[PDB]
Design a protein around this ligand. Sequence first.
Ligand SMILES: [Mg+2]
Ligand SMILES: [Mg+2]
Ligand SMILES: [Mg+2]
Ligand SMILES: [Mg+2]
Ligand SMILES: [Mg+2]
Ligand SMILES: [Mg+2]
Ligand SMILES: [Mg+2]
Ligand SMILES: [Mg+2]
Ligand SMILES: [Mg+2]
Ligand SMILES: [Mg+2]
Ligand SMILES: [Mg+2]
Ligand SMILES: [Mg+2]
Ligand SMILES: [Mg+2]
Ligand SMILES: [Mg+2]
Ligand SMILES: [Mg+2]
Lengths: 56, 129, 65
Amino acid sequence: PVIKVRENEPFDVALRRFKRSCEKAGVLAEVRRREFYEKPTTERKRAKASAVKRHA
Amino acid sequence: SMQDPIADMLTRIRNGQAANKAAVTMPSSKLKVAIANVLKEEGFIEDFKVEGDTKPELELTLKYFQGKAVVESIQRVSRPGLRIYKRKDELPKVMAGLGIAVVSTSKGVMTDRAARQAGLGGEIICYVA
Amino acid sequence: FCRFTEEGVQEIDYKDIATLKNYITESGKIVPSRITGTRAKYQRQLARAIKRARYLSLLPYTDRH
RNA sequence: AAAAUGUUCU
RNA sequence: AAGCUUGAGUCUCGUAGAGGGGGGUAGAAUUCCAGGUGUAGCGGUGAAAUGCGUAGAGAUCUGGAGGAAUACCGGUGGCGAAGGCGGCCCCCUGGACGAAGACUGACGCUCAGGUGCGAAAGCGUGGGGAGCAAACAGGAUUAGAUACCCUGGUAGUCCACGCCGUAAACGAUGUCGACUUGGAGGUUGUGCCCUUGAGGCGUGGCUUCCGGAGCUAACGCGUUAAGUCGACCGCCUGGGGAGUACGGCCGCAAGGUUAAAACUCAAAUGAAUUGACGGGGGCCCGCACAAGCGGUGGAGCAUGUGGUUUAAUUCGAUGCAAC
Ligand SMILES: [Mg+2]
Ligand SMILES: [Mg+2]
Ligand SMILES: [Mg+2]
Ligand SMILES: [Mg+2]
Ligand SMILES: [Mg+2]
Ligand SMILES: [Mg+2]
Ligand SMILES: [Mg+2]
Ligand SMILES: [Mg+2]
Ligand SMILES: [Mg+2]
Ligand SMILES: [Mg+2]
Ligand SMILES: [Mg+2]
Ligand SMILES: [Mg+2]
Ligand SMILES: [Mg+2]
Ligand SMILES: [Mg+2]
Ligand SMILES: [Mg+2]
């Protein structure tokens, strides 16, 4: 999520933009996922659950 | 594999009856044809049509008396994994003669009663109720 | 809306970076099929192409170097 | 963060 | 004995695929090393400590080494007989599917014994060894804590060639075939159509979800069945004893496999139902908390209780709901 403040632009706005970019990337989430090792089986189960949820 | 044709045919008939199919088609066979004829004679189907030269399709027109099936049940007694041959004395009767046993005999495929009359029995192909 | 299908392509080209880099995000990640609306086969092909590009260093793996 | 158990037969 | 083409195969052209084996390499990241910058913390947790750090850690940049795994794509997506298989590239290689047509002509299906493959762990010899991590150690937590948390950390995880041969190896559903209402998708072909546009109409393969009949103990399953039938094999006969003992066979061992008996219980089990409970979820409430104020528990006395004492200290009330 590389950002650079353009000419005549507030700080807060820039920060917000950066945050948005990060969210889009999925950086924090990714990090969280990689904080601990999930067993492949566990991961698969999770995926399945997600799929089920999606079927509304 | 298609290891019993007669049985398969019977099953098809039964399924048709269940699902309210006006007709039921399958690969024809001489024995199969005979069976169909017998059924027709006895009263359980309307008509059978053996349509084709190289690959003949037997097409049975199923009956539906008062919105339900005429063929109450249709079980193979004889089957490839265990054949059943009855002597004249042994010959079965389906629902105390309110339903037929298609038996293959030395003088053609016929209902059990017919066989009995003749003075013979044989491979009891299928109970039709 | 899948573009590749519309175009009528037999396979996506790794050499065609201009097309590919619409389907990779700013960070360098390969964009999802559900988002871009790509057909599944095409998506796989596209991904492969992207990978190839990265290997050859036409596209970047990530936006760090 | 930490919270163990419940004498028998009715 | 002769045939036939529907089953089963073969060929033509394509198709998608983490199918398998071998070999290359790519980038990110962790670790370590060397060097620079810099300074009191870093690290960790619930909080701590162990640990690492003024010998300069952590942070931060540069260069290197290595090992392992391949973010995103990534999808009840795909392929594989199942196990499983995930960066990209190449070489070898198996299957599946479709399109037509041509050919063989029942060559099929199933299969005890047998043979092969078979996750993970494990074992054997030799390599490798970053990260993770049984064991182990220390620190915590604890009443104890041979655990969960932390810090480390060896075997193992990686590779090569063998062995092991089991898993909730599961869809807890043997294989092959036929048939029976539908819908919503996914995936991958293919024929047709002014593609007048991302479309329209089919027809196949594989596959997820719902759901009809029917089946089921119900749960559910339901054209990929747990429906309807057929072929073949496997397995079951109350629970515990026990998948244990003995023996055999297999294994380097671990063990596996085959598989009892006595004795013993009158249950064991499944599904669902009403409750209750949950250190499950949601909504809501009462001096329930919070917010306050005043107490009690400390003292002296009054009073009741327990206990002890007593000849008797009448009997009863004894968690809130007795005192
Ligand atoms: Mg011929
Ligand atoms: Mg292993
Ligand atoms: Mg540990
Ligand atoms: Mg310890
Ligand atoms: Mg080893
Ligand atoms: Mg087993
Ligand atoms: Mg599963
Ligand atoms: Mg089983
Ligand atoms: Mg269903
Ligand atoms: Mg044993
Ligand atoms: Mg229950
Ligand atoms: Mg209060
Ligand atoms: Mg007192
Ligand atoms: Mg007082
Ligand atoms: Mg008293």
